[PDB]
Design an enzyme around this catalytic site. Sequence first.
Site: not given
Ligand SMILES: [Cu+2]
Ligand SMILES: [Cu+2]
Ligand SMILES: [Cu+2]
Ligand SMILES: [Cu+2]
Length: 495
Positions: A65, A110, A397, A402, A452-453, A455, A458, A463
């Site tokens: 991503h 990542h 959090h 996106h 999403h979170c 982390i 998570h 999450f």
């Molecule tokens: Cu989180």
């Molecule tokens: Cu990211």
């Molecule tokens: Cu993203």
């Molecule tokens: Cu994502």
Amino acid sequence: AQIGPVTDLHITNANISPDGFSRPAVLAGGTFPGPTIAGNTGDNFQITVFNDLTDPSMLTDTSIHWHGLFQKGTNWADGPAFVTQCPIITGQSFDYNFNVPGQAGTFWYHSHLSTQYCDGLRGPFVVYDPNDPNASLYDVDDDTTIITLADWYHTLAQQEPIGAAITADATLINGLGRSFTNTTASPLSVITVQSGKRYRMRLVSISCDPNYLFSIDGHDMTIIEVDGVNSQQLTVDQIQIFAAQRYSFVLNANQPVGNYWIRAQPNSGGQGFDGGINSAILRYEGATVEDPTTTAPTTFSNPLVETDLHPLADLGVPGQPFRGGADDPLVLNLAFANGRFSIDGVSFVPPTVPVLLQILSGAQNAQDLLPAGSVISLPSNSVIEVALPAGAAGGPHPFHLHGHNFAVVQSANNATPNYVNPIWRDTVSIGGTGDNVTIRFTTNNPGPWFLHCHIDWHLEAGFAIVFAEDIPDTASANPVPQAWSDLCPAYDQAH
Ligand SMILES: [Cu+2]
Ligand SMILES: [Cu+2]
Ligand SMILES: [Cu+2]
Ligand SMILES: [Cu+2]
Ligand SMILES: *[C@@H]1O[C@H](CO)[C@@H](O[C@@H]2O[C@H](CO)[C@@H](O)[C@H](O)[C@H]2NC(C)=O)[C@H](O)[C@H]1NC(C)=O
Ligand SMILES: *[C@@H]1O[C@H](CO)[C@@H](O[C@@H]2O[C@H](CO)[C@@H](O)[C@H](O)[C@H]2NC(C)=O)[C@H](O)[C@H]1NC(C)=O
Ligand code: NA
């Protein structure tokens, strides 16, 4: 050397020892962090990702991503596994071919399969602006002015024991740092500056989990960019940076020639700086090659507070200046129990068929889309508000959306919303118990966008939700290349 905007990117396993402890990793470009991918605003990136992974302990599939890039019309290139694609299997490659219209700033890339980015597949992604409105604030802006903050684990991400608390073993700044336990005097990163010059430091959290209190002894930092969004200048002496966030700040090399500690204190893991943990070195040209002898203040004078940030441009806030003043005002119930997170009662578990492919195959409402209850449709051309009240365990959090940035109408630790001039960004701490961090954006980007979170632990524990934005225009907006269409059959055949 920076690579891109057209480049290969090999994903391999290798041993690394960024804190003196050797472990195997998943790497892009053979390094941790991965090489900087870069181009100019509006460029066509063509990143051919070669999955050469062979160690199943860190997963031999992958998907990447490009964090913060909107992917308008190229949802298929966004990277979240089982949202926009099936993973790339080992021995295969995939060309992420996309454009970056209207964006310029500091991003990162990542893995977006499981917790694989924790195992090392993370690097910076910079979209330079040849006419940056902030250009006159600094003299130097190049690969040497990127500062990455990373958590590093001695245990492999897939091997973190069920029921044991996950904490990192080192903080890495530009890929180097020292371990919190059995600390050895492994090399620290050195950021070199020339007295009198001004630097655009591009601070990137590539964290899987902790937030960092980032500071530079003796120095102030003038923030000029927040998650890709140019800001008015805001001088701070400490930045609390949450996972996946970015800031650019001007560092004026205006202190006596010498060595100064760069500090990044995570909110978990090792506390303090004993043995040089949580540290790097700011070295002025001409200084002696030795460790700094500076200390932090007891109390910082001007820590970053998110409500102090304002866009450089007149971005405003879409909608109306009150809670619920949107076309589609949402309030998500964010919860944690028994090792699982949930959003509105549903814990995210990735579907077998990527959401995008489900839509392209004819699923035309969110009730048709899997995972059931995890996909929320958003109407097109509409102002969306999403309130994200905190309280769920494991906070604060950093929620990330996106396909979009968003106005942060309400920030952590402050009950007052801002419908006038809040910062826009793409990853926001939702704060603490009782907070009501709230975001707004307009839906002009058809496709399924993960929320999403950030982390990663998570996310893995559920999450997340997917916003299926403008289902009706998704297929038309996002023509898919054959190679994308080939991913799921190859993945499912490989199992
Ligand atoms: Cu989180
Ligand atoms: Cu990211
Ligand atoms: Cu993203
Ligand atoms: Cu994502
Ligand atoms: C966060 O703000 C949202 C609105 O953005 C609040 O949601 C309202 O909640 C009240 C009472 O719970 C409802 O009667 C309203 O219908 C809700 N508004 C919307 C748009 O659904 C929410 O209560 C706030 N949460 C916290 C913890 O302060
Ligand atoms: C809490 O957040 C609010 C809203 O962002 C901040 O209020 C703004 O404060 C600035 C600076 O004084 C004013 O110019 C604006 O008019 C305020 N906006 C609103 C809507 O009140 C407030 O400063 C934050 N609190 C703290 C302690 O930073
Ligand atoms: Na407005």
